[PDB]
Amino acid sequence: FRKISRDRGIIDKIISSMAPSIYGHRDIKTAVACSLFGGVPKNVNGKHSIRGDINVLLLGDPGTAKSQILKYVEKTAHRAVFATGQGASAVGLTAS
Amino acid sequence: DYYLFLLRHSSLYDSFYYSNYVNAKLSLWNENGKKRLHKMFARMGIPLSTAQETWLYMDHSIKRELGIIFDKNLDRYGLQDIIRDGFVRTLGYRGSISASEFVEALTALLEVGNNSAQKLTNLRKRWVSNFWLSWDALDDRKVELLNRGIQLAQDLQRAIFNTGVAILEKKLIKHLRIYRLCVLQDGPDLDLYRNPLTLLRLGNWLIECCAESEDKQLLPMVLASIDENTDTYLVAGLTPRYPRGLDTIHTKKPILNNFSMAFQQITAETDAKVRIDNFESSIIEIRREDLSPFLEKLTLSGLL
Amino acid sequence: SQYMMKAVRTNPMFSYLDLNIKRYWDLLIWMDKFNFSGLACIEIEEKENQDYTAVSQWQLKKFLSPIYQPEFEDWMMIILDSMLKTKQSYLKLNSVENSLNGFSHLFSKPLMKRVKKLFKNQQEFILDPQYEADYVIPVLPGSHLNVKNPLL
Amino acid sequence: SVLAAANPIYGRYDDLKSPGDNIDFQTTILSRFDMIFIVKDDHNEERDISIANHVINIHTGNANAMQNQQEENGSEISIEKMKRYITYCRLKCAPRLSPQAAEKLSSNFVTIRKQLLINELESTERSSIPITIRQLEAIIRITESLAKLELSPIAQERHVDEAIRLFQASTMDAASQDPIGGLNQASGTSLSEIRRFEQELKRRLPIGWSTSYQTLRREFVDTHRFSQLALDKALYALEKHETIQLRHQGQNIYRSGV
Ligand SMILES: Nc1ncnc2c1ncn2[C@@H]1O[C@H](COP(=O)(O)OP(=O)(O)OP(=O)(O)O)[C@@H](O)[C@H]1O
Secondary structure: OOOHHHOOOHHHHHHHOOOOOOOOOHHHHHHHHHHHHOOOOEEEOOOEEEOOOOOOOOOOOOOOOHHHHHHHHHHHOOOOOOOOHHHOOOOOOOOO | OEOOOOOOOOOHHHHHHOOHHHHHHHOOOOHHHHHHHHHHHHHHOOOOOHHHOOOOOOOHHHHHOHHHHHHHHOOOOOOHHHEOOOOEEEOOOOOEEEHHHHHHHHHHHHHOOOOOHHHHHHHHHHHHHHHHHHHHOOOOOOOHHHHHHHHHHHHHHHHHHHHHHHHHHOOOOEEOOOOEEEEEOOOOOHHHOOOHHHHHHHHHHHHHHHHOOOOOOOOOEEEEEEEOOOOEEEEEEEOOOOOOOOOOOOOOOOOOOOHHHHHHHHHHHOOOOEEOOOOOOOEEEEEOOOHHHHHHHHHHHOOO | OHHHHHHHHHOHHHOOOOOOOOOEEEEEEEEEOOEEEEEEEOOOOOOOOOOOEEEEEEHHHHHOOOOOHHHHHHHHHHHHHHHHHHHHHHHHHOOOOHHHOOOHHHHHHHHHHHHHHHHHHHHHHOOOHHHHHOOOOOOOOOOOOOOOOOOO | OOOOOOOOOOOOOOOOOOHHHOOOOOHHHHOOOOOOOOOOOOOOHHHHHHHHHHHHHHHOOHHHHHHHHHHHHOOOOOHHHHHHHHHHHHHHOOOOEOHHHHHHHHHHHHHHHHHHHHHHHHHOOOOOOOOOHHHHHHHHHHHHHHHHHOOOOOEOHHHHHHHHHHHHHHHHHHHOOOOOOOOOOOOOOHHHHHHHHHHHHHHHOOOOOEEEHHHHHHHHHHOOOOOOOOHHHHHHHHHOOOOOEEEOOOOEEEOOOO
């Protein structure tokens, strides 16, 4: 890891390695990579908390491989949960 | 006793972590040094949970056999030089204090406690005021001030370590032919380095880190720090040091500090807006605009 | 020009106004009335290539150090020449006024080297008391800025 | 005590629509809140730059390196010290009003309750934010709370003025949304009379020179064109930044632009 981390253009290869079999849509891949790696949460003097995670939205025409990208993100992530449409409730995405 | 930072008032892990010699010998600023320290603590037989407890509440059996554990294991990692003898003073049912911890508490009390000419005057007045705070701590009646000094020393060493890792990771040290330059222009808590003692602390950290480096050189170092309020750099010259455990064949009158004569020579010849008024002749205050040309002249000055 | 003058005079609103054309401009750089430069001709003639005079009135130069005031004028005289050359090339060839795209390519490389050399000389001589005559920021009526680095 | 936060319908306040179409809380629940704050964004450049710098200082670590100093010197106190001060004040003091404070509060209640009548009669619809006796008791409570800070045993006019100003900033501002135009039955004739009066005023008065409200009333009303709602028409014309300016203690009406 530390050997390959100092190569120039590691970010480009990481982006190119996201969902390789899907063609194009490089901005979606960049957003997915940024969400996967994530930011850094912060706490200022123990009274002001700042979130450190990135949320992504995909609004597009039918037949553009959005669901396959979601499945790839599910597979790659360490902890992943999947839900769809009317199959989820108020307390099914929350505590009951 | 041992070359450990505040052993009797903090944990064992903290003493090994914030030590100049251990950091120089193991490079704790990155991940490899921390992993090596964890491996050492695992080998020695002390659980990682026990090594993080307070010294008073540490397990009695481990404390009793600390000497044998040090003697038989420290040789593998090159830390056999941390064992020494010192002086410990005890007064009644109070607790033991070593000379080293006392001097660090006094230095911490000196450092922190309690239109630009007035700004500098107020700082110098506060520095004068801290003298009586350090003076009071030498009396046996005032022990709360000594405890406050110990806490201040812990915080100050943490800040020095935090700045040093940033300096070392970004390669801010520039290796010129005659000397090595380090100028701190951006970052947090640059208001702690307006005091000469804190800059000497950071310089002692860096020199200790460089002495144990495999690179063999004895070049003097220059450390510069900005103050936004005064718009002045405080610049200090630091002499190189031989490794602590090196033989006595090189031992002599130590390396001589030649920054005073060079600074006077440059100041006399040019109308630079520099202030050489401290008792230590190796510490000067130079205006922001003059820093980049002045140093160039120093490059051709010589004697360094 | 004659058609515009006749049209303006024809209007009853401006029947009694006196209008006279003083100069014709080929290339004009305008910031305000006290800062301008360019190429102008007093009056156009027939069958002779029009004579053009180059004017440059820059009050902005007065607030510079004495060593850099000649450089300001010298580099403006190169900017104007390059712009004229590229405008002539664009005219000959045939959102953006393509007459003046790419004029900076001709004088960029010399300017970088000149700036580097001037910076080196400034670093060498700024603290020399003998050269204290140079690097002096003038005091003028209406000057307010308090600034440190002359080449900047 | 209850501290509540909520968003309006459609997300943003949508100042184009009526207040009654923006707040879904009924009058029953809105009468139990002493202070109501309606929060909006103004999108000013200077404020945006100031907020951006303030937020970036928080993230880059420059926040703490400042804050401790002020907390040290004289301007801020820690959370625990303020907690102890709050409990000491609440368990030690309970102020009382003065005879002059009651007199100053009664007149303010009468004024703020009169204004609502004119607003409701003009807009010919009931107000969404109500003003009741609870709104008088709220101002009394705020006055006594202000007195509590200084451990004073009596509340005086100094505290009454600040309590009144806070109430004006909080609830009277929310009540007085002042719709520029709703295209409702109220001011129905004004839908054309506004343009009529604007044209009559812009043909009478060229881009220079000024007039007076006295004359613009007497002469334009001798022809029986008065509507009793022309007070805000001048301000609406002023909002165009060209039609009208008011100068000289509001007496002088100046034509400034197209
Ligand atoms: N470059 C591509 N762009 C779009 N679809 C692609 C591409 N390459 C392959 N496909 C295939 O096209 C099909 C359409 O993809 P998919 O079912 O994810 O579409 P969708 O409209 O985004 O789906 P949904 O409505 O479930 O979110 C899939 O079988 C996918 O594997």
